[PDB]
Amino acid sequence: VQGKIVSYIPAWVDWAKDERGVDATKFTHLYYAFGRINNGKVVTIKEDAKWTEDPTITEADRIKRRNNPDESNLAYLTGLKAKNPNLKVLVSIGGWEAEGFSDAALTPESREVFANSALDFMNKYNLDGIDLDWEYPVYGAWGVIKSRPEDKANFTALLKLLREKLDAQSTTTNKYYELAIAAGASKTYTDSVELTKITPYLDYINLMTYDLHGGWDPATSHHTAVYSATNNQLSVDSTVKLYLNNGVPAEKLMVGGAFYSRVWQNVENKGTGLSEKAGSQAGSPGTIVYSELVNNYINKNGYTRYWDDTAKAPYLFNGSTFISYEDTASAAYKAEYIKQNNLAGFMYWEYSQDSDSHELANTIYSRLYAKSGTPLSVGTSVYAGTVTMATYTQLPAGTFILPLTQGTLKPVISASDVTVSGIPAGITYTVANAADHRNAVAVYVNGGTVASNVYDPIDVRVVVKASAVLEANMTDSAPASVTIMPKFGPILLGYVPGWVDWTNSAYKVDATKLTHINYAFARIKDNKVVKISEDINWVNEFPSEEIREQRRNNPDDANFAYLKTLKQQNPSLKVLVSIGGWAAEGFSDAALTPETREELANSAIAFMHQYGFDGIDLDWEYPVYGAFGVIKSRPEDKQNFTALLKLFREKLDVEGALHGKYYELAIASAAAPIYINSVELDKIHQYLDYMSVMTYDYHGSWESKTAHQASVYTSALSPGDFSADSVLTAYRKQGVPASKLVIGGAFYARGWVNVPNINHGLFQQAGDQAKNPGTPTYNDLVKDYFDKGYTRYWDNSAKAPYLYNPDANGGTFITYDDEESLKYKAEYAKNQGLRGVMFWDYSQDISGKLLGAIFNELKA
Numbered sequence: 001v002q003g004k005i006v007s008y009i010p011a012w013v014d015w016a017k018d019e020r021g022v023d024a025t026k027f028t029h030l031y032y033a034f035g036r037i038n039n040g041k042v043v044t045i046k047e048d049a050k051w052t053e054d055p056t057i058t059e060a061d062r063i064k065r066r067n068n069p070d071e072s073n074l075a076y077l078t079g080l081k082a083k084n085p086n087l088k089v090l091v092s093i094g095g096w097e098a099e100g101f102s103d104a105a106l107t108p109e110s111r112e113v114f115a116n117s118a119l120d121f122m123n124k125y126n127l128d129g130i131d132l133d134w135e136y137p138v139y140g141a142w143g144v145i146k147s148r149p150e151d152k153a154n155f156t157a158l159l160k161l162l163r164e165k166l167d168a169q170s171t172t173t174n175k176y177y178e179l180a181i182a183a184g185a186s187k188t189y190t191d192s193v194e195l196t197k198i199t200p201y202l203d204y205i206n207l208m209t210y211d212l213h214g215g216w217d218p219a220t221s222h223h224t225a226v227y228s229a230t231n232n233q234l235s236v237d238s239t240v241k242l243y244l245n246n247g248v249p250a251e252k253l254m255v256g257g258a259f260y261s262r263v264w265q266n267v268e269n270k271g272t273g274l275s276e277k278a279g280s281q282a283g284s285p286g287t288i289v290y291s292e293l294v295n296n297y298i299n300k301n302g303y304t305r306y307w308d309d310t311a312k313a314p315y316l317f318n319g320s321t322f323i324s325y326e327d328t329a330s331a332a333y334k335a336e337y338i339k340q341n342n343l344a345g346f347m348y349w350e351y352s353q354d355s356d357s358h359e360l361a362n363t364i365y366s367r368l369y370a371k372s373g374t375p376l377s378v379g380t381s382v383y384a385g386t387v388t389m390a391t392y393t394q395l396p397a398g399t400f401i402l403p404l405t406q407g408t409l410k411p412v413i414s415a416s417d418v419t420v421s422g423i424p425a426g427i428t429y430t431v432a433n434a435a436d437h438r439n440a441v442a443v444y445v446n447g448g449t450v451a452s453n454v455y456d457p458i459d460v461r462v463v464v465k466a467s468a469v470l471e472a473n474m475t476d477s478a479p480a481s482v483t484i485m486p487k488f489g490p491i492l493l494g495y496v497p498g499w500v501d502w503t504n505s506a507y508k509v510d511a512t513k514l515t516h517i518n519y520a521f522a523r524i525k526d527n528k529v530v531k532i533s534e535d536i537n538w539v540n541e542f543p544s545e546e547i548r549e550q551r552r553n554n555p556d557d558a559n560f561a562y563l564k565t566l567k568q569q570n571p572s573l574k575v576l577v578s579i580g581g582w583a584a585e586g587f588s589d590a591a592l593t594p595e596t597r598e599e600l601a602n603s604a605i606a607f608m609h610q611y612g613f614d615g616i617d618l619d620w621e622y623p624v625y626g627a628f629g630v631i632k633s634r635p636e637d638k639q640n641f642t643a644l645l646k647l648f649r650e651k652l653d654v655e656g657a658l659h660g661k662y663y664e665l666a667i668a669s670a671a672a673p674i675y676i677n678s679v680e681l682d683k684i685h686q687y688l689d690y691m692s693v694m695t696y697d698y699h700g701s702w703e704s705k706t707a708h709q710a711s712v713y714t715s716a717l718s719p720g721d722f723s724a725d726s727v728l729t730a731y732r733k734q735g736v737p738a739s740k741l742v743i744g745g746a747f748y749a750r751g752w753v754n755v756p757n758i759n760h761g762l763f764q765q766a767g768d769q770a771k772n773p774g775t776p777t778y779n780d781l782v783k784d785y786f787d788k789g790y791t792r793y794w795d796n797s798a799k800a801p802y803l804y805n806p807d808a809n810g811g812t813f814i815t816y817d818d819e820e821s822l823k824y825k826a827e828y829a830k831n832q833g834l835r836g837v838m839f840w841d842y843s844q845d846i847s848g849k850l851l852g853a854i855f856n857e858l859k860a
């Protein structure tokens, strides 16, 4: 990590007890806002008179202010060195309207008591440095604070001293300490401080290049723009130029940006509202934070979004309220300026004001640790990914929607900026910006009649061109995958295990809710597909003979007949054979040569015809890496798997053209990045009906830290971590159409014994893992857990349930899929244009609720 990122964080949130925590891997420094001065000395904000007594809400809030948890905050924040080692946490002193800088600084005497107490503060909370935010010396923000002309010098002296105290301490500790200032943007500020004396005492000067204009001005303008587009409009550029002219070296200047807007009301309804006269601001809230703009203002509630292309700043206007803000784009242009002009880094006030998802802080990081002159591509995610055929030929009016993940659409895109591949001919389509979204394309797909019958999903491909976007040197987007579904809708597929005698089980299979069954499994033996009772590895997994017998007399013939009655009873039901699965030997050998591939194909085709199947699922676990030596693997598996699949599909096309029927070919495929490496995902998919992605087994007893085994989304408390969302995005990134992906639900759990009672059990360091529960099924969970000690919590940013019991071996943490999570996996599949939903496995919920909740969302 090269240039710096400073993220001020407010003292007046509970960060320990916040739901989103802090992704401290996206900034370098973290200034804590603020400590204050009291009787000439640095202190916690909860000990500040003037801030504990704000009359805006003096009831429930003043209490919270006097008992403000800074101790907890500081401990939680420096604790984030866990996730980032490099991180620095400084204490920032002052802020807007913070009093007593002029008295504490005034005389050599009082400076001591302040600079001393400032170290006491730094030491006490184990902090990497001090930041003085005096606003402002000499002129006191024109009467907001106490001030006198002698500040000019005293500021200098105070700063010199602090540097002495912080180098003194360094020579014993071996840790260099940092000293910063936030510094005013105006010519007036530079005139009130001794810059060519001050610079050398400091590591960085935080230019506050915001609040450059606001409701105090008679006309609108940008408050935190990059460039000056008119003579009178201040900017990062004007301010940086002002500071270089006074000798301050580029290498120490941090450019500032803002996660909030400056607002004007009663603006003349002329032009765009930019540079228009403005009346009374007596009604005005003054600012609106970035999260609130996202939620209700940007392209919402009659507020049009605009861009000043010379200033490189966004603004909104509705005919009378104007709002000037920092967005994804303006941050891009500011990062670029830092790099263009060799500045120290990007500073921002402040972190809490970012969106739920941290859109700005993440944008800055991404832009600042891009390598220059090596263009970034436009990013896409999906919000609405499916339109569904009414009949075999009638397509209704529908609308796909794609938010940008990287880059920022012009407020009005032209057709040349988006190209749509794979709308079937006959059917007119339009592109545009999606209403009620800040930054998203809309392909409006008009009703129509398609030329021929639509039996299979159609992959629609959307390309977001560089000309669409506002940023500078950017390349076209990877062609994004959305889906026109056939009239029958998503598939819902159960893995049905062959080691249950379903003929005699009181618990039966629900062929009315499933579209698809995968009988698990067939196997490989001497390069032949055979029943599971022939595979010696399996039969002889355990020595004990009363198992081994059950294994040899596995009720395959029965179950195949049983499945035949399901098929007769429900004639659209498709039942397929899964060759392989965990510990299944034979695949690598079988894929080697054009002779060995031919053998297995023919033998698989013949197994399929003999016991009544509608297609094949291949379940190779796993190629090239062989699940880390469970399975003979080879580098050459990669291109072989792909010839195996190409072959199977050709044999199955032969079969189908002989039996007057369509045979399916499918694989199961893992989530791990090594799988995605080890397989030619871009190449194999054209041969498949879909991929049953195993969006589960993310974390187990093989780690000693708790985490979500099957989360539909990546929790906020574990950035980076596995989710269905992350994994299926990763799949599509490789080129796999959405309409050939299937999301996996798991009907069993995992867990860890010896989890400390912290945060309901969640993301904790684990203990000794002997007597770990292994994999209890939901059945097990119903009898022996749910009410029997344990308590069910829910992480809403992940949408994944979890159990903790303090009084059981540590206690224990359980991670699983349930009704609510399976619902969301199913919503995700409809929203994203996925082929369908899948699970493992039918025998693990005899109650039928997990299936019910997939079915109730996916189909009704």
Ligand SMILES: CC(=O)N[C@@H]1[C@@H](O)[C@H](O[C@@H]2O[C@H](CO)[C@@H](O)[C@H](O)[C@H]2NC(C)=O)[C@@H](CO)O[C@H]1O
Residues within 6 Å of the ligand: 008, 094, 095, 096, 097, 098, 133, 135, 182, 208, 211, 260, 287, 349
């Ligand atoms: C580094 C920096 O920008 N410092 C100043 C900030 O304090 C100021 O933010 C304001 O801080 C006050 C505490 O001093 C808060 O009461 C107030 O709510 C907060 N304002 C906002 C919009 O979050 C910022 C922004 O005006 O500018 C500096 O002056």
